[PDB]
Design a protein around this nucleic acid. Structure first.
Ligand SMILES: [Mg+2]
Ligand SMILES: [Mg+2]
Ligand SMILES: [Mg+2]
Ligand SMILES: [Mg+2]
Ligand SMILES: [Mg+2]
Ligand SMILES: [Mg+2]
Ligand SMILES: [Mg+2]
Ligand SMILES: [Mg+2]
Ligand SMILES: [Mg+2]
Ligand SMILES: [Mg+2]
Ligand SMILES: [Mg+2]
Ligand SMILES: [Mg+2]
Ligand SMILES: [Mg+2]
Ligand SMILES: [Mg+2]
Ligand SMILES: [Mg+2]
Ligand SMILES: [Mg+2]
Ligand SMILES: [Mg+2]
Ligand SMILES: [Mg+2]
Ligand SMILES: [Mg+2]
Ligand SMILES: [Mg+2]
Ligand SMILES: [Mg+2]
Ligand SMILES: [Mg+2]
Ligand SMILES: [Mg+2]
Ligand SMILES: [Mg+2]
Ligand SMILES: [Mg+2]
Ligand SMILES: [Mg+2]
Ligand SMILES: [Mg+2]
Ligand SMILES: [Mg+2]
Ligand SMILES: [Mg+2]
Ligand SMILES: [Mg+2]
Ligand SMILES: [Mg+2]
Ligand SMILES: [Mg+2]
Ligand SMILES: [Mg+2]
Ligand SMILES: [Mg+2]
Ligand SMILES: [Mg+2]
Ligand SMILES: [Mg+2]
Ligand SMILES: [Mg+2]
Ligand SMILES: [Mg+2]
Ligand SMILES: [Mg+2]
Ligand SMILES: [Mg+2]
Ligand SMILES: [Mg+2]
Ligand SMILES: [Mg+2]
Ligand SMILES: [Mg+2]
Ligand SMILES: [Mg+2]
Ligand SMILES: [Mg+2]
Ligand SMILES: [Mg+2]
Ligand SMILES: [Mg+2]
Ligand SMILES: [Mg+2]
Ligand SMILES: [Mg+2]
Ligand SMILES: [Mg+2]
Ligand SMILES: [Mg+2]
Ligand SMILES: [Mg+2]
Ligand SMILES: [Mg+2]
Ligand SMILES: [Mg+2]
Ligand SMILES: [Mg+2]
Ligand SMILES: [Mg+2]
Ligand SMILES: [Mg+2]
Ligand SMILES: [Mg+2]
Ligand SMILES: [Mg+2]
Ligand SMILES: [Mg+2]
Ligand SMILES: [Mg+2]
Ligand SMILES: [Mg+2]
Ligand SMILES: [Mg+2]
Ligand SMILES: [Mg+2]
Ligand SMILES: [Mg+2]
Ligand SMILES: [Mg+2]
Ligand SMILES: [Mg+2]
Ligand SMILES: [Mg+2]
Ligand SMILES: [Mg+2]
Ligand SMILES: [Mg+2]
Ligand SMILES: [Mg+2]
Ligand SMILES: [Mg+2]
Ligand SMILES: [Mg+2]
Ligand SMILES: [Mg+2]
Ligand SMILES: [Mg+2]
Ligand SMILES: [Mg+2]
Ligand SMILES: [Mg+2]
Ligand SMILES: [Mg+2]
Ligand SMILES: [Mg+2]
Ligand SMILES: [Mg+2]
Ligand SMILES: [Mg+2]
Ligand SMILES: [Mg+2]
Ligand SMILES: [Mg+2]
Ligand SMILES: [Mg+2]
Ligand SMILES: [Mg+2]
Ligand SMILES: [Mg+2]
Ligand SMILES: [Mg+2]
Ligand SMILES: [Mg+2]
Ligand SMILES: [Mg+2]
Lengths: 208, 174, 38, 141
RNA sequence: GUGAAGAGGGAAACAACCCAGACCGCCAGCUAAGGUCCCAAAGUCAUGGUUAAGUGGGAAACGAUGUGGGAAGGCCCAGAC
RNA sequence: CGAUGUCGGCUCAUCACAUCCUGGGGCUGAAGUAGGUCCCAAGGGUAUGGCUGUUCGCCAUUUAAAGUGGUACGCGAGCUG
RNA sequence: UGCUGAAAGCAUCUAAGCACGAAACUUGCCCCGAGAUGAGUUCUCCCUGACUCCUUGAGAGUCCUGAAGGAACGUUGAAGA
């Protein structure tokens, strides 16, 4: 299915043979189920979960009622996961990090870090034009953006300067290292999207 | 035309049934069903079978002359049961049957396990020869052709899977 | 096989067939005579 | 005398069902596009949407002559750098069977606000069941 | 001959191609070229055939038991192919 | 002609298939290895240097390959000159 | 490349029927995405007061009530012109 969990920096695990494997520390608290969507009502089978804890005020009535339907505490944010036919869950059930104990590799999805209005050099790996040798006011500019009369136009999906980052991205098949049940952690090899404190939708590897 | 005008004999213990155009021939070896073409018209006449071209349609004789030749093989199939004699030529090559799965070793890195769809009774008189039997000419012919298509004859030593009746043209080194 | 625009019956065992619209010439003796199109 | 012209308020639009099982696509689509426009009606006016609401159920089962089940291609551009997407008549019904009658009718109607307005009336369907039981849509052939 | 110096209908759009020469009006009818299942006015019109390639809806030398018509020419009851 | 900035390079490309590599096949004067030609295939990839303004070309060394073309012989209100 | 199999006693991969078959094509993988005007679904939340007025209408009014929620303002951010 998958679990939601906040990113908590990175560390390295020293394996006894030698290798210092770089790991991301994902805290994965008791992900508790708010709604069980199914084929009768919704036309698909899925579960909506929550985690963390909002203060008793910042949650609105429409959202707070939604939590009373299930009976769970008002966790911060809400996410959904599609069920894989065989598995079936109940409302108000608390899923833990133990689901990732059996699995080897995981797809971690998150929100990548916001770089802002990035140029074509940074955003699309464009080559900067000659820094000197005559050059005039066009070092880091894109250069040409089209042909001539023929298209009489720039084509759609042209690589240009714009908003870089702050987008949902998925790093696939990251190898799990340790599943700390007691501290509610999930140590995965490598680096995952977003800054410390950002939410990570972790799930088992679709590319098996 | 000429084939179409030559009634098919139906031996005893062979239940033929005409569900409109859908023909069902049952016998000792197996039950066979054939959804025949709409342009063909078929009936029972005395002991033998009769195949007539439908008036109105363009190509009758061509369609019925097929039906005749199909049902001729279909009647012989349920009566006798068709067989094919395949042989594996070349050193290191091996053929062995376990249940309904033929284990071909044809010098590959992995042993090939060929499945047998439908009622096809596979046998092995020797380790380098596959004799397989059944009701349908179609399925046997296909199975045989797959088992062949795993390793066609090398036209130098005649190596690979071959039909027993087939001749193979080999050539010299230049 | 060849794809020449004027396929012909080269030897005695060659044979003309029309498969999927395309005229092909198939042969028993020499596979060289096998050819397509035209 | 100034001739009569149908008044959008006074138009009394009727509902119909057409089972498209074993029908010729174009000759169905033509008769559909005839009614949708409001041609058959004696109070026809080209600038008012006089035509009737039609439900075309069993769209997936529509028939085509010749080799057009395979041969007939539906080209469309994606509005992109070099994105020309094609799809055969088999592959079209395989995915979206409602599109076949839709596209076959849309072309036969006029092009413009009223042309789009008179398409809205058409209600194609893959399954035999239709949820428009409330209007009492009578049988049409 | 037409345009230039001529509008109008057709040939998708198309000065010169086909039809036809605008004095003005009318919410009348008959026809030309060209058309008549829908976009779009008017025949899913009638009779006897042909095409199976989407030909119609670009093209040659040359290629082939594609398929229709014909007019002939090789053999039989000693039974040829 | 009351101006449509002409070669080459850089930056940015994009389409065609008459495919240079990679993928699937037929024949072969195809033992294997490696080819030769031909067929389908445009998904992705497709040098860095020396010389010269060069395009091209020759040369050194790589590479699986170092494809042929269209795009105002693509691209100067993007740069160089 | 085949299997069965006519037309054409045979033959032949096809005219009926039945299989294989590539980085192409449709999915699978990632992202955006109901302004998808064809504007889908599920879930929860909140409003349950009077009066006159005339061409009695989804009319126009008037005392009161102002909810859910939002915006604004402030402290601000690994969000951002
Ligand atoms: Mg408050
Ligand atoms: Mg807030
Ligand atoms: Mg939010
Ligand atoms: Mg940021
Ligand atoms: Mg960079
Ligand atoms: Mg980077
Ligand atoms: Mg550079
Ligand atoms: Mg300068
Ligand atoms: Mg400048
Ligand atoms: Mg400068
Ligand atoms: Mg300057
Ligand atoms: Mg500038
Ligand atoms: Mg400037
Ligand atoms: Mg053009
Ligand atoms: Mg344009
Ligand atoms: Mg790996
Ligand atoms: Mg070979
Ligand atoms: Mg060719
Ligand atoms: Mg076919
Ligand atoms: Mg593409
Ligand atoms: Mg129009
Ligand atoms: Mg409307
Ligand atoms: Mg004129
Ligand atoms: Mg004109
Ligand atoms: Mg005109
Ligand atoms: Mg014309
Ligand atoms: Mg004409
Ligand atoms: Mg024209
Ligand atoms: Mg025309
Ligand atoms: Mg016109
Ligand atoms: Mg002209
Ligand atoms: Mg006059
Ligand atoms: Mg008249
Ligand atoms: Mg006329
Ligand atoms: Mg007209
Ligand atoms: Mg009409
Ligand atoms: Mg013509
Ligand atoms: Mg010829
Ligand atoms: Mg001929
Ligand atoms: Mg000027
Ligand atoms: Mg240049
Ligand atoms: Mg260079
Ligand atoms: Mg460049
Ligand atoms: Mg090619
Ligand atoms: Mg070539
Ligand atoms: Mg091969
Ligand atoms: Mg490409
Ligand atoms: Mg393509
Ligand atoms: Mg693909
Ligand atoms: Mg250089
Ligand atoms: Mg030097
Ligand atoms: Mg000089
Ligand atoms: Mg060049
Ligand atoms: Mg050149
Ligand atoms: Mg020159
Ligand atoms: Mg060159
Ligand atoms: Mg060079
Ligand atoms: Mg060299
Ligand atoms: Mg070298
Ligand atoms: Mg080398
Ligand atoms: Mg090499
Ligand atoms: Mg080479
Ligand atoms: Mg040129
Ligand atoms: Mg240029
Ligand atoms: Mg230039
Ligand atoms: Mg320019
Ligand atoms: Mg100079
Ligand atoms: Mg035969
Ligand atoms: Mg690959
Ligand atoms: Mg693939
Ligand atoms: Mg591979
Ligand atoms: Mg999916
Ligand atoms: Mg998705
Ligand atoms: Mg997503
Ligand atoms: Mg993007
Ligand atoms: Mg985005
Ligand atoms: Mg949106
Ligand atoms: Mg909406
Ligand atoms: Mg709906
Ligand atoms: Mg009231
Ligand atoms: Mg009222
Ligand atoms: Mg009011
Ligand atoms: Mg008030
Ligand atoms: Mg207020
Ligand atoms: Mg209140
Ligand atoms: Mg509030
Ligand atoms: Mg409030
Ligand atoms: Mg609000
Ligand atoms: Mg601030």
């Amino acid at each position: 299915i998958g679990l939601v969990g906040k990113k908590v920096g990175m560390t390295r695990i020293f394996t006894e043979d030698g290798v210092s494997i770089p790991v991301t520390v994902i805290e994965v608290e008791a992900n508790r189920v708010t709604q069980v969507k199914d084929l009768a009502n919704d036309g698909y089978r899925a579960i909506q979960v929550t985690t963390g804890a909002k203060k008793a005020n910042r949650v609105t009535k429409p959202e707070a009622g939604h939590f009373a339907k299930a009976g769970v505490e008002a966790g911060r944010g809400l996410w959904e996961f599609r069920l894989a036919e065989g598995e079936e869950f109940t409302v108000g059930q608390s899923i833990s990090v133990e689901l990732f104990a059996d699995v080897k590799k995981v797809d971690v999805t998150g929100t990548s870090k916001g770089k802002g209005f990035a140029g074509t050099v940074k955003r699309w790996n464009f080559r900067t034009q000659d820094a000197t040798h005559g050059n005039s006011l066009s070092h880091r500019v894109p250069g040409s953006i089209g042909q001539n009369q023929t298209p009489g136009k720039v084509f759609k999906g042209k690589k240009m300067a714009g908003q870089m980052g702050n987008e949902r991205v998925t790093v696939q098949s990251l190898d799990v290292v340790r599943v700390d049940a007691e501290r509610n952690l999930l140590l995965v090899k490598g680096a995952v999207p977003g800054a410390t404190g950002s939410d990570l939708i972790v799930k088992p590897a679709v590319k098996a | 035309s000429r084939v179409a005008k030559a009634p098919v004999v139906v031996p005893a213990g062979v239940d033929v049934k005409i569900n409109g155009q859908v023909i069902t021939i049952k016998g000792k070896n197996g039950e066979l069903t054939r959804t025949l073409n709409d342009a063909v018209e078929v009936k029972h006449a005395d002991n033998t079978l009769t195949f007539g071209p439908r008036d109105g349609y363009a190509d009758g004789w061509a369609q019925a002359g097929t039906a005749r030749a199909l049902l001729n093989s279909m009647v012989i199939g349920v009566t006798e049961g068709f067989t094919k004699k395949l042989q594996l030529v070349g050193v290191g090559y091996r053929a062995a049957v376990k249940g309904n799965v033929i284990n071909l070793s044809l010098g590959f890195s992995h042993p090939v396990d060929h499945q047998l769809p439908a009622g096809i009774t596979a046998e092995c008189p020797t380790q380098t020869e596959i004799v397989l039997k059944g009701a349908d000419k179609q399925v046997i012919g296909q199975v045989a052709a797959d088992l062949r298509a795993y390793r066609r004859p090398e036209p130098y030593k005649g190596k690979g899977v071959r039909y027993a009746d087939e001749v193979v043209r080999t050539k010299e080194a230049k | 096989m060849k794809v020449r625009a004027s396929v012909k019956k080269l030897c005695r065992n060659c044979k003309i067939v029309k498969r999927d619209g395309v005229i092909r010439v198939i042969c028993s003796a020499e596979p060289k005579h096998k050819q397509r199109q035209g | 005398m100034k001739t009569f012209t149908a008044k959008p308020e006074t138009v009394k639009r009727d509902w119909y069902v057409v089972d498209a099982t074993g029908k010729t696509l174009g000759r169905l689509a033509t008769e559909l596009a005839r009614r949708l426009r409001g041609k058959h009606k004696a109070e026809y006016t080209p600038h008012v949407d006089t035509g009737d609401y039609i439900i075309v159920l069993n769209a997936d089962k529509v028939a085509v002559t010749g080799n057009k089940r395979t041969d007939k291609v539906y080209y469309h551009h994606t509005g992109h750098i070099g994105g020309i997407k094609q799809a055969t008549f088999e592959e079209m019904i395989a995915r979206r069977p409602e599109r076949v009658i839709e596209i076959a009718v849309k072309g036969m109607l006029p092009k413009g606000p009223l042309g789009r307005a008179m398409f809205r009336k058409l209600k194609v369907y893959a399954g035999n069941e239709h949820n428009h039981a409330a209007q009492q849509p009578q049988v049409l052939d």
